[PDB]
Amino acid sequence: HWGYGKHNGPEHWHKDFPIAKGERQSPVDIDTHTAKYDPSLKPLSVSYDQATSLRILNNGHAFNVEFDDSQDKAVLKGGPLDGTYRLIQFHFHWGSLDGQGSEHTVDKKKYAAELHLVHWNTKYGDFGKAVQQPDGLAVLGIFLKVGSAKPGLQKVVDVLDSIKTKGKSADFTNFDPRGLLPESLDYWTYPGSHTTPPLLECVTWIVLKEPISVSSEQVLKFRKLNFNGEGEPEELMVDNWRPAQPLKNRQIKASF
Ligand SMILES: [Zn+2]
């Protein structure tokens, strides 16, 4: 099936998911000079004090931190959004080297990694139904640069050993997502899609301007993950990012 290799990479996805070359595909390049300042844009509201993490899993394309979304426990509202979005999971995209890894780019600049906090619109009742709506999801994107270590991230780094290969999972309770947020909530927003198959065009992108710094050692551990299942040839999980897609008329607005 699809992956990030030469034979099943992003350039091949269109064959199985024709929407690959749709009109509101993601990620894109954020041109800071063309992005439009919108004063009608409300401040983001991140309510994660009562978040409940459950576990972490290696799905063979990335690692996911799953949360209990049976109640309005960890929610996102305000900004360009209408209604309440519930956090379901978070994952990252990274590279083989520090000069690449982000999906979205700023003025063509690539970051070391990119964190995705995925949320679904409650009016649709479940994740599965939300992915069928134009306003079904809301993903908060955060860039990672290499500098100083991120204390909040270390809990996640230490558990990777446990989910080395495709299909493994481990209990992961009492993880507070708040340790991964930058100081500023200033952002860019545009309508787009998921960055992995089914690449459904149901996402309201919310990309934070201010990146979070992670240490060399922390990102190094990400790079030790495997795409492959256990007992199979070892394929390091690196460069699990999709290249920037055409804006195609769409407009990127700024909250600042
Ligand atoms: Zn993602």
UniProtKB/Swiss-Prot annotation:
One GO-annotated biological process of the protein: secretion
Effect after changing Q89P: In OPTB3; in Czechoslovakia
Mutagenesis or variant effect for G141R: In OPTB3; complete loss of activity
Phosphoserine PTM positions: S162, S169
Residues engaged in binding Zn(2+): H91, H93, H116
Location of the protein in the cell: Cytoplasm; Cell membrane
Activity regulation note: Activated by X-ray, histamine, L-adrenaline, L- and D-phenylalanine, L- and D-histidine, L-His-OMe and beta-Ala-His (carnosine).
Effect in UniProt of substituting H116E: Strongly reduced activity
Site residues (Involved in the binding of some activators, including histamine and L-histidine), renumbered to this chain: Q89
Main enzyme class: lyase
Cellular component, GO annotation: apical part of cell; cytoplasm; cytosol; extracellular exosome; myelin sheath; plasma membrane
Keyword Metal-binding in record: yes
Domain Alpha-carbonic anhydrase per the UniProt entry, residue ranges: 1-256
Record note on what altering V139H does: Impaired activity
Pfam families: Carb_anhydrase
Residue(s) at site: Fine-tunes the proton-transfer properties of H-64: Y4, N59, N64
EC number(s) reported in the record: 4.2.1.1, 4.2.1.69
Alphabetical keyword list: Acetylation, Cell membrane, Cytoplasm, Disease variant, Lyase, Membrane, Metal-binding, Osteopetrosis, Phosphoprotein, Zinc
The protein's required cofactors: Zn(2+); Co(2+)
Record annotation: effect of changing T195 to A/C/H/P: Strongly reduced activity
Domain of life of the source: Eukaryota
Subunit (UniProt): Interacts with SLC4A4. Interaction with SLC4A7 regulates SLC4A7 transporter activity. Interacts with SLC26A6 isoform 4 (via C-terminus cytoplasmic domain).
Protein name: Carbonic anhydrase 2
Organism, scientific name: Homo sapiens
